[PDB]
């Protein structure tokens, strides 16, 4: 029944500097909170328990404080293998996780490398035509993906899929396809997938 | 050395019953308790519950006592859970963790890979695996593709040349078209090869592995 | 009448032999004709006798001079002077021996050598090769003396001969090749008398074929290559101009240029 | 008479001592070419003929720029299926390959093996330097300049010292890109910066593959910055200071070299 209110729900900072979580309990805890770092993919793991006890082979610069219903976790000397999702768990009575917490790190800015590939053969048998566009390794994560058939606009059919963050240049990377019919895609000739002066790379059949 | 090897991805039909496994591979399985923690793709994590093996002891979230049923195998170091009457709201993925109860300072160490579940009325489709030929791309290194479109469930494993190398690999999520899915993945090598390079796409549920 | 340089090996130094060689070079050839940065000789087919000659004066040390001929058309030695005596190599036409008869005028006696100027009579009648007769100024300074005493009977044929092949290299084909300018201008510099490396024959036995692949070049690349030597005489083979442009410096009329 | 150019089917070298290359041994309209070491057998992927219509043919195709801009990729084509003045090209005696339409050079824009071939706009770099020949190996020489003295450079400064031939810090090799690299290292080139007056040429690597790298044995006796316009230059003709400027072309005995093969 013990509400655990963990701010803020995301964060952003760079490399070499320090953020601060901060936890609320509904009531006194009695310092029976712990801290985890959850990475996509992996299982979570414990760094800290018992308010401020670190774990075994984590590295100093995490640390924890609090007492009562009040908690904080600090990590100094950021670095690009920290990006994860934190969480505070209370363990005083039964168990309560916390909202969780998304940490950015904060790069220099960086263009996308953006490639282009025209539907396969082999998917032209099949009925259908897609044409592919990448997006890899840019800052910041915010990018529009402009797709021009003939010059002209087409937003209908494009499906967009964003990765997590790089956990060592610090990185995004976006894939948008736009899946369009074989005949609907023989009808048009030139294909080109613009960034946002915006970045262009295109075929031509 | 203390692995939680949990079952693999789970796919079931609203309404039906799904088992989760959790071996234990590092310890005495019968001294710790062994947690549950659910985590959707908008909600945290929460937690489920918790068995004492070598016990009977159960703890329920409440939330979930008359979904869960946590059951141990003390012969094999392997717990389960079982989630009943499946609604699309259980479509999750689940976590078993080890909590060594032996002082209540303690909280949970250990967690499991995690196994997806979903919960969809969906049929099992293979995805038809599609290369991405690019000749006019420098950046001192060419940028191949695999396009990985139309297949049914989660998740596909896509690798190059039979896992090398991962300078290099960008393997995109799935989106889902309501319930179909689709995902790219591309890989940069340098310029002087193309010696060869092809990647391999596993999608186990449809039991399909194309070499394209 | 015809235009003269004048050389002295007395206090010769690098700047006074670099000076010569490039004074005899500007009255060569007009600098015109330049194929692939390469000047090129005029033509021997239209040239009036008035430009076919040059005069190439040597004194060394103890007032001994001699006066040489070289023909403008591939810039080798065609005769001597001395005093009131001239002698000539047997030309290898009848035309050219008309040109001969245009050469000093001041001279009391014609002689006619039964030989000619290449260097496989040169070499037999010397009783050497050019790789054992050594060059540089005190060679040159000798040989000067060995033109001026032939006419009284004073210096014996293979000295004469060998005395040719050190003003030909020296004079002429350091002319052609500002390679071999720069290996006697390496001799006359530290004071070393040498003879030529390997790399230096194979360049002076090419230099029909390097003129006729430079000027008969499709952009500059050769129809078929040439094989060289280095120091160790090792060989290597030459595919396009490009490094032949520090080596060559003049080069015989083989062909006019294309319109274009 | 007249000269009659023939048709030398010849290889054509560039940066870091890479033959000009059809990638993949493969001849089908749009195949771009790379840089590729040269091999010592006889395929007709590096085998060039020196058409007399200014076309550039391997196995029959022609080499073919992609456009008129920079910097398009370069690629084997059907000489009669492309643009007929897309596939001229004129071999220039400083080592430059040059699309009379565009005004554009062939260039390499990577040292790596297999890049792919583009033009660019001229600036005379190391990237836009080649050499027709057979020749798969550079020139090796000493170079010898003012008093007599030989090149040499020691990991980072080039000067001039003793010719002593012994000492292989004095040994050259001369790259078809138009690189003037030591024997030691041949990762590292003989580089001019900023094209300034009295700038101390240097020993750097070729990475960048820079106009400044790129010199030119002239007929005069001088090596030429062709970009800059400037000579190296033993500065004040004191071998003493151990330092090789770039400086404008005057002839004197302190820019004449020559390379004792
Ligand atoms: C190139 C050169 O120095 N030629 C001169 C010439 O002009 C002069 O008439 C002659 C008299 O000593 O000497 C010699």
């Known amino acids: 029944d013990i509400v655990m209110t963990q701010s803020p729900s995301s964060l952003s900072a760079s490399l070499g500097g320090r953020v601060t979580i901060t936890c609320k309990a509904s009531?006194?805890?009695?310092?029976?909170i712990g801290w985890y770092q959850h990475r996509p993919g992996k299982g979570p793991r414990l760094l800290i328990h018992y308010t401020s006890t670190l774990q075994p082979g984590i590295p100093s610069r995490f640390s924890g404080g609090g007492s009562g219903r009040d908690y904080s976790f600090n990590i100094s000397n950021l670095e690009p293998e920290d990006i994860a999702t934190y969480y505070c768990?209370?363990?005083?009575?039964?168990?309560?996780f916390g909202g969780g917490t998304k940490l950015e790190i904060k790069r220099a800015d960086a263009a996308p490398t953006v490639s282009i590939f025209p539907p396969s053969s082999e998917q032209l048998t099949s009925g259908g035509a897609s044409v592919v566009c990448f997006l890899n390794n840019f800052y910041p994560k915010d990018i529009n993906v402009k797709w021009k058939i003939d010059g002209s606009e087409r937003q209908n059919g494009v499906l967009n899929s964003w990765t997590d963050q790089d956990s060592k240049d610090s990185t995004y990377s976006m894939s948008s396809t736009l899946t369009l019919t074989k005949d609907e895609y023989e009808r048009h000739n030139s294909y080109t997938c613009e960034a946002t002066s915006p970045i262009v790379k295109s075929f031509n059949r | 050395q203390v692995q939680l090897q949990q079952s693999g991805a789970e796919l079931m039909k609203p309404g039906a019953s799904v088992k989760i496994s959790c071996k234990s591979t590092g310890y005495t399985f019968s001294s710790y308790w062994i947690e549950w923690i659910k985590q959707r793709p908008g909600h945290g994590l929460e937690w489920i519950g918790e068995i004492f093996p070598g016990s009977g002891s159960i703890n329920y979230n409440e939330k979930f006592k008359g979904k869960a049923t946590f059951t141990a195998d003390t012969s094999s170091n392997t717990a389960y859970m079982q989630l009943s009457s499946l609604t699309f709201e259980d479509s999750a993925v689940y976590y078993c963790?080890?909590?060594?109860?032996?002082?209540?300072?303690?909280?949970?160490?250990?967690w499991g890979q995690g196994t997806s579940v979903t919960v969809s009325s969906a049929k099992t489709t293979p995805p038809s695996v599609y290369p991405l030929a690019p000749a006019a791309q420098t950046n001192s290194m060419v940028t191949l593709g695999c396009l990985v479109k139309g297949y049914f469930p989660e998740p596909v494993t896509v690798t190059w040349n039979s896992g090398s190398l991962s300078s290099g690999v960008h393997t995109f999520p799935a989106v889902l078209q309501s319930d179909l899915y689709t995902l790219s993945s591309s890989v940069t090598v340098p310029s002087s090869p193309r010696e060869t390079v092809t990647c391999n796409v596993a999608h186990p549920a449809s039991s399909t592995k194309v070499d394209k | 009448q015809y235009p003269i340089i004048n050389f002295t090996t007395a206090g010769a130094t690098v700047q006074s032999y670099t000076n010569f060689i490039r004074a005899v070079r500007g009255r060569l050839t007009t600098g015109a004709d330049v194929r692939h940065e390469i000047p090129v000789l005029p033509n021997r087919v239209g040239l009036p006798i008035n430009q076919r000659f040059i005069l190439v004066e040597l004194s060394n040390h103890a007032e001994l001079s001699v006066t040489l001929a070289l023909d403008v058309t591939n810039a080798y030695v065609v005769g001597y002077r001395a005093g009131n005596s001239a002698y000539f190599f047997h030309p290898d036409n009848q035309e050219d021996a008309e040109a001969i008869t245009h050469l000093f005028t001041d001279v009391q006696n014609r002689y006619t050598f039964a030989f000619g100027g290449n260097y496989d009579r040169l070499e037999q009648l010397a009783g050497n090769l050019r790789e054992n007769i050594e060059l540089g100024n005190g060679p040159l300074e000798e040989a000067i003396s060995a033109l001026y005493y032939y006419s009284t009977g004073g210096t014996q044929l293979p000295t004469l001969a060998r005395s040719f092949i050190i003003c030909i290299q020296m004079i002429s084909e350091a002319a052609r090749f500002q390679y071999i300018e720069g290996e006697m201008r390496t001799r006359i510099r530290y004071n070393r008398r040498s003879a030529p490396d390997p790399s230096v024959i194979t360049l002076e036995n090419s230099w029909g074929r390097l003129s006729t692949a430079i000027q008969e070049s499709n952009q500059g690349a050769f129809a078929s290559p040439i094989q060289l030597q280095r120091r160790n005489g090792s060989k290597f083979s030459v595919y396009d101009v490009s490094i032949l442009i520090p080596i060559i410096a003049l080069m015989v009329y083989r062909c006019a240029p294309p319109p274009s | 008479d007249v000269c009659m150019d023939p048709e030398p089917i010849v290889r054509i070298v560039g940066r870091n001592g890479l033959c000009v290359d059809v990638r993949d041994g493969r001849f089908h309209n749009g195949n771009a070419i790379q840089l590729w070491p040269c091999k010592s057998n006889t395929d007709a992927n590096q085998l060039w003929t020196l058409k007399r219509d200014n076309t550039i043919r391997s196995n029959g195709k022609c080499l073919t720029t992609y456009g008129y801009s920079p910097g398009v990729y370069v690629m084997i084509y059907d000489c009669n299926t492309a643009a007929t003045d897309a596939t001229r090209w004129q071999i220039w005696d400083n080592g430059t390959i040059i699309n009379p339409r565009s005004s554009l050079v062939l260039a390499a824009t990577s040292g790596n093996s297999g890049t792919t071939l583009t033009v660019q706009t001229n600036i005379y770099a190391v990237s836009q330097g080649w050499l027709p020949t057979n020749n798969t190996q550079p020139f090796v020489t000493t170079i010898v300049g003012l008093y007599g003295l030989c090149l040499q450079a020691n990991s980072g400064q080039v000067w001039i010292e003793d010719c002593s031939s012994e000492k292989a810090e004095q040994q050259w090799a001369l790259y078809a890109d138009g690189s003037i690299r030591p024997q030691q290292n041949r990762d590292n080139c003989l580089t001019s910066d900023s094209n300034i007056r009295e700038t101390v040429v240097k020993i750097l690597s070729c990475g960048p593959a820079s106009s400044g790298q790129r010199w030119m044995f002239k007929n005069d006796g001088t090596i030429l910055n062709l970009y800059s316009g400037l000579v190296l230059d033993v500065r004040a003709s004191d071998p003493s200071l151990k330092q090789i400027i770039l400086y404008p072309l005057h002839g004197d005995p302190n820019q004449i070299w020559l390379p004792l093969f």
């Open positions: 963790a080890r909590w060594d109860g032996n002082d209540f300072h303690n909280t949970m160490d250990y």
């Open positions: 768990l209370q363990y005083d009575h039964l168990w309560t």
């Open positions: 009531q006194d805890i009695k310092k029976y």
